């Protein structure tokens, strides 16, 4: 109805088909769908070199879907449970039919698995799409899981999204010294780096991918002959400065010599470094200037794809003119600009791996074919020998698991991509998803690309930063920001040939002409001539805006340079925007009664020029407006809503207005791990740190973006009555006097689970198979606290407080006690060195579930729900929704806490010392809309850039009997009379984080220095406790007291007075050294075993062994 | 998961008052007035019902 | 001899002993949840 409601109810309109996570699933859907067939187009067709041509030919490779549909879970259909318990993996075989060009003519077209696709959970092939929260029972899973993460041997592995810069694009930087035209192109294959440079005082050369040295450009232009060097100079430019500056290079070339192509190019014919592959050029003895020019078809190595070299000529001649930035000292082009950074995404990496694994398998098939010639049999290519099937399985799973997309064709052995979903709630289950990870940033500690550039207002969150090392380097793609995969360049080629974009083979170096705006970059691909940018661009927009070409094809019109791009390639961010129609937003204030109830079915606001999709570039053209209320009549697009730069994990604060930026960074880190209700699965599943609560409460000052997450059905923190009050010296630096009698009445339980996995192996020769079962059953504890609490069968114990290093499970462990060769005969399982699985911490767990989850191999797991209800104590972690992370200072009893007049006494207590220097005024308000929303029954909103102001809330508090300001009138329990100054109150929403003081119980009894690795108890694997590393002993030695330092030395790890010297003596006895008992060479010197290990390990690597003593006395 | 029997900071008994609202949200008072016909005249128990998520039903949907 | 093998997918019990991997009667269903036991565990009710 109003002017406003339309633009704030476009959210459930687009958040269904392409929303907040669904870019992951969209990309991988396409990559299952068609791009695998695309890679199939790289058919075999070469395999029979020494053969009567028995080529294979993939008829149609689909992900289990050539002629088939139900091949999408080919382990006898299996849910994600039966993949998160049995630890199995999703699997759909990438089946295919093959077209033997067989000389025995049996063209066999059986559907052959080629491996297995690890299907992204909830893709358009999984069994969890198009199903209701009732159908989500037989599949054991929530309806509202994020979805989009893989199944890696029972471990949820998401794929972080990288930020790799654009291909096909010049990068004309400006060093403090000189200009750099570095066109780092590609062909989906390799990082080819055909960079130009302003090398030596006006001297231009090409650090090509290979070429042995720096090649003067004018000779390069000769290599694509434009030999009339007049044409070189006129093409580069026509003004004074350009001609003069370029002059030196032509002068140097001519002074060398001016020849055509058949000479002066042997000057580069032999000067080529890809000549380094003399052995890689076995046939075609034809190798010199003319022949690296024959192989100069690949000396494209750039987007422009011609055989007559005029395209590469003009590319170099716009390179050479956009490196001389007309005295390129004032002109600067910056790297970190999200029109340049194009997101390669989980699916894209999987597409690289599709390509490379099919090509690797085809290469090994080719090798087998090229060795099988002596075989006079039919199985030169047959399916039976074609038997790497289901081993692309291992490649894919290794890639997704180890995080290694190890490659050869693409020049990247990337490690560090895939991670495990931090299922501490569903808040961090999303925050883990929808995360973008940075890239090279040449010196990552050079903080240029660390501050948030203004160049993605919208598309990346402002406040989602993990303070520390990954600040500004791991990024939450946190909202409405839709994403593009790829297009077809054809139906822009047609509109270029039509719309007034000439063919560049009709003109020469007129291209310094200001009417002739002549960037036409169809995705880097070459260029288009014709003038009239301000008509081509505008009619192209107003043609896609009316049902034609797909609304993603952004086009920038910059005037500093003659920039008119057509970027229709992948990695592009996006956003929706309301079309202003240059006078008034085209939603007409009455689309609501279509935006909500009946029709305009939806996304049909994209087929009507009503709301449209931008990029970064097109945002660099347009002129947006925040609200309608302040449109000024020159605006091209309109903001749907302000609150979607603050995104899914970051739009959890109430009133994120008023906080600082640091405070919202703190909160949007803390809120992730905070103990919460994982959802609906919880009990049916098994997983490590299921940090539940037991009595959680919905937020109560909520945000319109808390609803949209659906994760306000699953709130992560208790909703706590709270004062603002200073009790007695324990509160002080963000500490909390949480009263007992609310810990008692259940405020903030925990249900810390953990997980023991008795991976009961099997072995080839000897067997674990039958050997299960302790229960010796002696007298004391049937038998003993070794095997006291297991069961009849020693496996399970669903409900018994198994305590402090009892047995959770044991197994006699005969693994290889029989030697696999003809070894000892007697070890037919009397040789069990039993390996107990026992450990625990200093409190009782309670075995709650026992699992015999056994995959197809009998490799018995024992999954176990070791639940430990560690309710809080002095030291536990709180957060606040405002990066206000206090800790329980005291724990007071009920009767001492202040009571207002009604009878309310705090649960939590803060002191008003976290606010005035952090300035979270988003908390003095949350306690207004709590106490005003409950005292009235309401359920309030403070939403980013909207909310509910202070005046209406104040009047609500008035109506149910309190201040405008909600400041109660408290008397003090301790003494029994009114506090002198009033006391803030009302509901807060305290989250209860992980990282308590019970998971952090650690201490060390003794540390010696061992002999095995000759180490003290360093860090973990020996005990918990300390680790005096670099800065720690740096402080230790920096004291200023002599034998305080001496004591630290004498007690460091060990000070054994072993006997060793130089004069016929070594590391041996003292009284009578069997090494050398000369009886005059007894030393008994204090020394840690580390120096002795140095002695040993340097015996192999010879070095001067000085050894001597001196008198302590006079 | 289930209803706190006591208002963590009040004392009042609560768990007796969840199968009345699911019968007083269909007499269709405003929540603020389904929680005045049952006694809750303070902050506390208003939180302890208005804010709680009965995961009991949805969890038990597939318990076995 | 005990029957401690429920199946969240076949609500029935086998305890077919070792060298018989899991199979819940007539199916794979290798997702045994094992029954609780009959010891009178004591809880501080606090």
PDB file of C-alpha atoms in Angstrom, chain A residues 291-381:
ATOM      1  CA  UNK A 291      58.499 -21.473 -36.768  1.00  0.00           C
ATOM      2  CA  UNK A 292      58.043 -19.870 -33.410  1.00  0.00           C
ATOM      3  CA  UNK A 293      55.868 -17.654 -35.604  1.00  0.00           C
ATOM      4  CA  UNK A 294      54.030 -20.780 -36.763  1.00  0.00           C
ATOM      5  CA  UNK A 295      53.707 -21.630 -33.066  1.00  0.00           C
ATOM      6  CA  UNK A 296      52.875 -17.959 -32.507  1.00  0.00           C
ATOM      7  CA  UNK A 297      49.234 -18.908 -32.898  1.00  0.00           C
ATOM      8  CA  UNK A 298      49.631 -19.844 -29.237  1.00  0.00           C
ATOM      9  CA  UNK A 299      51.749 -16.627 -28.886  1.00  0.00           C
ATOM     10  CA  UNK A 300      48.338 -15.342 -28.551  1.00  0.00           C
ATOM     11  CA  UNK A 301      48.451 -16.501 -24.913  1.00  0.00           C
ATOM     12  CA  UNK A 302      45.782 -13.782 -24.549  1.00  0.00           C
ATOM     13  CA  UNK A 303      41.973 -13.452 -24.889  1.00  0.00           C
ATOM     14  CA  UNK A 304      42.132 -12.452 -28.576  1.00  0.00           C
ATOM     15  CA  UNK A 305      41.796 -15.508 -30.773  1.00  0.00           C
ATOM     16  CA  UNK A 306      42.712 -14.806 -34.408  1.00  0.00           C
ATOM     17  CA  UNK A 307      45.009 -16.240 -37.094  1.00  0.00           C
ATOM     18  CA  UNK A 308      45.592 -13.029 -39.031  1.00  0.00           C
ATOM     19  CA  UNK A 309      47.543 -11.175 -36.415  1.00  0.00           C
ATOM     20  CA  UNK A 310      45.786  -7.796 -36.683  1.00  0.00           C
ATOM     21  CA  UNK A 311      43.753  -8.576 -33.554  1.00  0.00           C
ATOM     22  CA  UNK A 312      46.874  -9.260 -31.509  1.00  0.00           C
ATOM     23  CA  UNK A 313      48.439  -6.184 -33.142  1.00  0.00           C
ATOM     24  CA  UNK A 314      45.711  -3.831 -31.963  1.00  0.00           C
ATOM     25  CA  UNK A 315      45.760  -5.548 -28.578  1.00  0.00           C
ATOM     26  CA  UNK A 316      49.466  -4.795 -28.219  1.00  0.00           C
ATOM     27  CA  UNK A 317      48.931  -1.284 -29.592  1.00  0.00           C
ATOM     28  CA  UNK A 318      46.279  -0.510 -27.006  1.00  0.00           C
ATOM     29  CA  UNK A 319      48.506  -2.160 -24.413  1.00  0.00           C
ATOM     30  CA  UNK A 320      51.365   0.116 -25.495  1.00  0.00           C
ATOM     31  CA  UNK A 321      49.070   3.137 -25.370  1.00  0.00           C
ATOM     32  CA  UNK A 322      47.573   2.137 -22.007  1.00  0.00           C
ATOM     33  CA  UNK A 323      51.015   1.723 -20.502  1.00  0.00           C
ATOM     34  CA  UNK A 324      52.164   5.187 -21.557  1.00  0.00           C
ATOM     35  CA  UNK A 325      49.376   6.796 -19.539  1.00  0.00           C
ATOM     36  CA  UNK A 326      50.134  10.139 -21.195  1.00  0.00           C
ATOM     37  CA  UNK A 327      52.964  10.733 -18.740  1.00  0.00           C
ATOM     38  CA  UNK A 328      51.758   7.891 -16.580  1.00  0.00           C
ATOM     39  CA  UNK A 329      52.446   9.604 -13.270  1.00  0.00           C
ATOM     40  CA  UNK A 330      48.973  11.010 -12.557  1.00  0.00           C
ATOM     41  CA  UNK A 331      47.001   7.993 -13.826  1.00  0.00           C
ATOM     42  CA  UNK A 332      46.587   5.119 -11.356  1.00  0.00           C
ATOM     43  CA  UNK A 333      44.601   1.875 -11.676  1.00  0.00           C
ATOM     44  CA  UNK A 334      44.222   0.023  -8.381  1.00  0.00           C
ATOM     45  CA  UNK A 335      44.146  -3.754  -8.003  1.00  0.00           C
ATOM     46  CA  UNK A 336      41.650  -4.308  -5.183  1.00  0.00           C
ATOM     47  CA  UNK A 337      38.418  -3.282  -6.931  1.00  0.00           C
ATOM     48  CA  UNK A 338      35.662  -5.844  -6.991  1.00  0.00           C
ATOM     49  CA  UNK A 339      35.005  -5.325 -10.665  1.00  0.00           C
ATOM     50  CA  UNK A 340      38.453  -6.885 -10.969  1.00  0.00           C
ATOM     51  CA  UNK A 341      38.232  -9.615  -8.310  1.00  0.00           C
ATOM     52  CA  UNK A 342      35.988 -12.380  -9.651  1.00  0.00           C
ATOM     53  CA  UNK A 343      34.890 -15.068  -7.207  1.00  0.00           C
ATOM     54  CA  UNK A 344      35.963 -18.568  -8.145  1.00  0.00           C
ATOM     55  CA  UNK A 345      33.683 -20.757  -6.126  1.00  0.00           C
ATOM     56  CA  UNK A 346      33.216 -24.312  -4.854  1.00  0.00           C
ATOM     57  CA  UNK A 347      31.661 -25.388  -8.117  1.00  0.00           C
ATOM     58  CA  UNK A 348      34.371 -23.696 -10.184  1.00  0.00           C
ATOM     59  CA  UNK A 349      37.115 -25.621  -8.387  1.00  0.00           C
ATOM     60  CA  UNK A 350      35.099 -28.790  -8.881  1.00  0.00           C
ATOM     61  CA  UNK A 351      34.917 -27.894 -12.585  1.00  0.00           C
ATOM     62  CA  UNK A 352      38.687 -27.559 -12.800  1.00  0.00           C
ATOM     63  CA  UNK A 353      38.889 -30.995 -11.193  1.00  0.00           C
ATOM     64  CA  UNK A 354      36.269 -32.470 -13.534  1.00  0.00           C
ATOM     65  CA  UNK A 355      38.404 -31.262 -16.440  1.00  0.00           C
ATOM     66  CA  UNK A 356      41.692 -32.472 -15.031  1.00  0.00           C
ATOM     67  CA  UNK A 357      40.627 -35.877 -13.732  1.00  0.00           C
ATOM     68  CA  UNK A 358      38.835 -36.787 -16.964  1.00  0.00           C
ATOM     69  CA  UNK A 359      41.894 -35.648 -18.915  1.00  0.00           C
ATOM     70  CA  UNK A 360      44.249 -37.585 -16.603  1.00  0.00           C
ATOM     71  CA  UNK A 361      42.174 -40.747 -16.942  1.00  0.00           C
ATOM     72  CA  UNK A 362      42.047 -40.238 -20.697  1.00  0.00           C
ATOM     73  CA  UNK A 363      45.822 -39.734 -20.744  1.00  0.00           C
ATOM     74  CA  UNK A 364      46.444 -42.987 -18.881  1.00  0.00           C
ATOM     75  CA  UNK A 365      43.990 -44.708 -21.227  1.00  0.00           C
ATOM     76  CA  UNK A 366      45.996 -43.224 -24.107  1.00  0.00           C
ATOM     77  CA  UNK A 367      49.226 -44.578 -22.625  1.00  0.00           C
ATOM     78  CA  UNK A 368      47.711 -48.044 -22.221  1.00  0.00           C
ATOM     79  CA  UNK A 369      46.507 -47.863 -25.828  1.00  0.00           C
ATOM     80  CA  UNK A 370      49.946 -46.742 -27.034  1.00  0.00           C
ATOM     81  CA  UNK A 371      51.549 -49.712 -25.279  1.00  0.00           C
ATOM     82  CA  UNK A 372      48.897 -52.338 -26.133  1.00  0.00           C
ATOM     83  CA  UNK A 373      49.760 -52.519 -29.873  1.00  0.00           C
ATOM     84  CA  UNK A 374      51.572 -55.892 -29.498  1.00  0.00           C
ATOM     85  CA  UNK A 375      48.346 -57.312 -28.019  1.00  0.00           C
ATOM     86  CA  UNK A 376      46.512 -58.927 -30.946  1.00  0.00           C
ATOM     87  CA  UNK A 377      43.332 -59.182 -28.850  1.00  0.00           C
ATOM     88  CA  UNK A 378      40.098 -57.201 -28.799  1.00  0.00           C
ATOM     89  CA  UNK A 379      40.728 -55.622 -25.389  1.00  0.00           C
ATOM     90  CA  UNK A 380      42.936 -52.808 -26.651  1.00  0.00           C
ATOM     91  CA  UNK A 381      40.292 -50.341 -25.433  1.00  0.00           C
TER      92      UNK A 381
END
